[PDB]
C-alpha cells in the first residue's frame, strides 16, 4: 500500500524522503499523466506503469510483507499479487537512490498544469 | 550469476532444487521460447523479463553479493547493477516455493520442441 511505500521511502532516502518524492514532476505520486520531467520522474513513471500491471489486487491500498535491513528493503510474504506490489515499490525506491544526483527542486510540487499533454506510453 | 541462482534454489527448495527447477517448462532455462507451461514456469518467465531489464552488467555471468540465512535470501553489495540481478534471482526462487503445490514432473525436462510456438512478450 502507499502507506508502506511512504515508510519504504523514508527508510531508504531518509525521513525527509516522503515529502521530497511523493509530489515531484508529472508522475511522482500516483496516477500521473503527460511526459516525465527527468530521470527521477521517470522512476515514478515506471512505478505507475508497474502498478498498472497489478490486476489480482489493489497496489494502492493492499498491504504487503517486507523488511528493512542495512539501508535496503526486502519483499517477503507468499501472496504472488502482493509480492508484485512490493516489488514495484522497492524498485522505485532504489531508482530514486540511483538518480539522486539529478534531483531538481524545480520539479518539487510541480503542478499538474504542465503535465496536461498526451502521456508517454508504458 | 546462475551459479549463485543455483545456490539460492537449493537452499530454499532443497538439495534437488536445481535439478528440478532450472530445466522446467519453457522458461526456467534462459532464452525461453513459446508459452509458459504453468505457474512455476511463469516464475521463470518473469525471471527472464527481470533479467531483460538489467542494463550495464551480465545477469547470467556476473557475480553479486548475497547471503543465505534463516531460510531466507538477502541481497546486498555496492554495485546497483549486480544487486538488480540478485533481486531477480531471489524473487524467482521464493516464487518457486509459493507454487510448489502445482509443480508437475510432466514439465520437468520438457523438450524444447514442446516449446516451439509463438513466444509470449515481456
Swiss-Prot record, chains A, B:
Source superkingdom: Eukaryota
Subcellular location: Secreted
Gene Ontology terms for molecular function: calcium ion binding; calcium-dependent phospholipase A2 activity; phospholipid binding; toxin activity
Active site residues according to the UniProt entry: 47, 89
Residues bound to Ca(2+): 27, 31-32, 48
Chief subcellular location: secreted
InterPro entries: PLipase_A2, PLipase_A2_Asp_AS, PLipase_A2_dom, PLipase_A2_dom_sf, PLipase_A2_His_AS
Cofactor note: Binds 1 Ca(2+) ion per subunit.
Keyword DNA-binding: no
Catalytic activity: a 1,2-diacyl-sn-glycero-3-phosphocholine + H2O = a 1-acyl-sn-glycero-3-phosphocholine + a fatty acid + H(+)
More details: This enzyme has been found to be not myotoxic, not cytotoxic, not hemorrhagic and not lethal.
Family of the protein in this entry: Belongs to the phospholipase A2 family. Group II subfamily. D49 sub-subfamily.
Protein name per UniProt: Acidic phospholipase A2 BthA-1
Source organism of the structure: Bothrops jararacussu (Jararacussu)
